[PDB]
Each structure stands twice: as structure tokens, then as C-alpha cells.
Amino acid sequence: FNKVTLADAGFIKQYGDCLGDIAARDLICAQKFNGLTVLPPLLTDEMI
Amino acid sequence: CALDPLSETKCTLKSFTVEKGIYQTSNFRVQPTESIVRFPNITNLCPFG
């Protein structure tokens, strides 16, 4: 799980960076990348 | 098409019956919408006249 990295993957990584966790009170990160959204998978990692 | 979401689903689904599932009908809750401006002080008028 560590040999696969997203560091040099611009949009996906920086969309994953809408988890500032307090950094901005009102961050709707679906209104920051102009419609480009990423749905979550039906199955997590723990269940696989 | 503006009612309990069920209705707008029927709208998009183009049928007056819907099955069991989910449907993206997003961006449908009207935006904040005002009209104003901020600027500077350029007291001098032009000589165009």
C-alpha cells in the first residue's frame, strides 16, 4: 500500500487535498475544480 | 420539475415512472446571486472634452 503513490499526479492529488480538516471552515471542494468530481468506490479498503 | 426531488428525477428519467436506484441531478439549489463593486479614487476628469 505504500509503493503506489499519488505525489506526481496533479489534479487527483490536489483534489485529495480538500481534507484540510480545519484549515478553512467553508471548503466545498466540489466547487473548486470546475465540475470535475471524483465519486468514492462502493467498497472501501478494509472490506476488500 | 421543481418539487420533491422524485419529480425532477421523473423529469430527467424522461418517464413518468422510476425504478429503484440513484440519479445524479446535481447543482440544482439556486446560487447566492448579488451585484456590487469595489474600486479606486481617480478624482481628475479627462481632457477629452
Add this chain to the structure above:
Amino acid sequence: LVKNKCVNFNFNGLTGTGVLTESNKKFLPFQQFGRDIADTTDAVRDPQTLEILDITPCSFGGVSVITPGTNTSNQVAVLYQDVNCTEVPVAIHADQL
């Protein structure tokens, strides 16, 4: 402007539009208005107050609709996109809807 809705922040030109974002980072003497990977004007320096201020575009997430069959029942329930529940109706601008 206002500082909470799509007041159309027309900061010295650019008809920037965006709710909230009372943002703050760092700039430079030349540095005036923000620009990201896609130029997305990050922040700006107000024409007559002169500071730093980023803003998120018209900030309203997306909605889908769960359903049992239309004829199975008329009940529905909506599932949004990534939005903390705190701002749900206010994050769908419930007031006018």
C-alpha cells in the same frame, strides 16, 4: 462587497464571484491577484484596502436522489456530494429553493 455569497467580487476589474473565503496567505509587492494550476484566481489585493484574499467559486455541492420504485412508494431521500452536514441546507442555499 458582502463576504458571504456570490456577491460577484469585481475586485478592480475581474468579475470574480464567490461566497465567503475571507482567506489569507502571502504575496509580494508585484503580487496582486491569485492564480492556480488553472489560473483559478486564488486571492487578490483590494483596490482601496489593499490586502490578500482568496475565494472558492460559487460554493454549492451536488445532489443525487435515492429511490425505491416510483410505484413501490413515493418516498425519496437525497444524498449530496462531499459536504459536511453542518452546511447542508445553507450549503444548498435552502432559504431560496
Add this chain to the structure above:
Amino acid sequence: AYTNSFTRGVYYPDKVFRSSVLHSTQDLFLPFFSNVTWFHAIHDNPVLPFNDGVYFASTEKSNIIRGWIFGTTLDSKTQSLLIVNNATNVVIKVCEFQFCNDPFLGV
């Protein structure tokens, strides 16, 4: 003289607030690893051409290099340019004027 400019000539080519990205500009810029010319204690102050731009800074010995003045003809046929230092700020100046080639002010 002629020396390898290992890496110099990088100036914000813009005035837009930018942050952790990688932008690919396209403008006049000092060609890397290129060369330069100059002079030394010759007595000096020669003339030199301008093309489009001139990356130019130097060993300020004890501040001795003072100001860089332009001026194509100096028969006073063009209000060109002149820059030195007048306490508060440099004497930005324009007028076609004498172009006293060897600065002097008493000092």
C-alpha cells in the same frame, strides 16, 4: 571580460499571484550558461549597445559604480534617459542633455 554565467537571469516575468505550481513562461530571458563582457581599472567608462535587455550587475567595490545612463546621439537630439542616486531616490531624468560622458559632482 568573458565568463560563464553559471545560472543567472531569472526575474518574475509576470505580476500574477502564483504559488506551488510549475508555470512555463516564454519571454526575453538571459540565455543560461552564456557569456558577458566588461572592463576594469583602465586609466573605465566605455559605451555599449542594448539590443533588448541587459542582464547587468557588478562588483560594487565601495559603491563606485554609480548609475547607468542611456542616450544614442548625445548631440542632444533625443530626450533619452539618465539614472544615478539623489539621496531620496535615483535621479530619474529624461531630457536631451549634454550627456556629460564622465560624471562629476564635486564629491
Add this chain to the structure above:
Amino acid sequence: ILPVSMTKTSVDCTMYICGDSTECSNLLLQYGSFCTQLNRALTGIAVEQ
């Protein structure tokens, strides 16, 4: 090592094309249902994953 699935994306056709401009949307309406087609294809992929 075998790949099994990939990232599920989706895109707001109107936001991408005419983002927030209500004069642009009325012009987009002249091209028929292209946004609907695109969203349909993307949804198909997202379920396939």
C-alpha cells in the same frame, strides 16, 4: 500484479462549459442534449468500476 479498477470521475458539463454564466447556458441549449449524453457515458463507466 493485475489492475482491477480505476478512478471514478464525473463532470458537471454546464459548469465546465458555461460556468455560472446564465447567458452562456441559453446558448448551450441550442446544441441539443450533449451534456446528458456525456453524463450518461461517464455514469456507465463509474458503475462498471
Add this chain to the structure above:
Amino acid sequence: QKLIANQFNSAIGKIQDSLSSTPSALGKLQDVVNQNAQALNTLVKQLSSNFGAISSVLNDILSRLDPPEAEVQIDRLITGRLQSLQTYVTQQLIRA
């Protein structure tokens, strides 16, 4: 049974280090992800072309030209961005 047990256990340990070493055997995995992203980045960058218009950002075009003129500029931008979207979707389908 004695030394088939050993061989097995040891070899598993090998797989462990081998992976850890740095072969990203998960290359056949990385690609996919990256490949996708690249496709996204292009799409995003495609928002700066003006496809023949006098500018790119809609807000401006709207903020400079009257509606009757706006028509031209707007339409061209629309066609350009529509084509970008179409290409992206078709590529996604193939990769799918």
C-alpha cells in the same frame, strides 16, 4: 515435509523484500492512475485556450462585449470546450 516447509516460508520472505526493494511491480498499477490523471490535467489546462475568441474566461467576454456581439465569441468558446469534453470522454471509454 521438512524442507518443503522451509523453502516455502523463506520464499515468501523473499517476495516481501523483493517488493520492498523498489521494483514498483505495482507499475502495471501506477500507470492506470497516472494515465488517468494526465488525462484530467489536459482537460483542466484546456480551459485557457480561446479557440479563436478574443479572450478565454467567459466572465470577461461577457464583461466587454454586448450580447449581440457576445454571440460570436461565446459560440466559438462553446464549440472548443465541447470538443475537449468529447475527446476526454471517448478516451475514458476506451481505457475503461
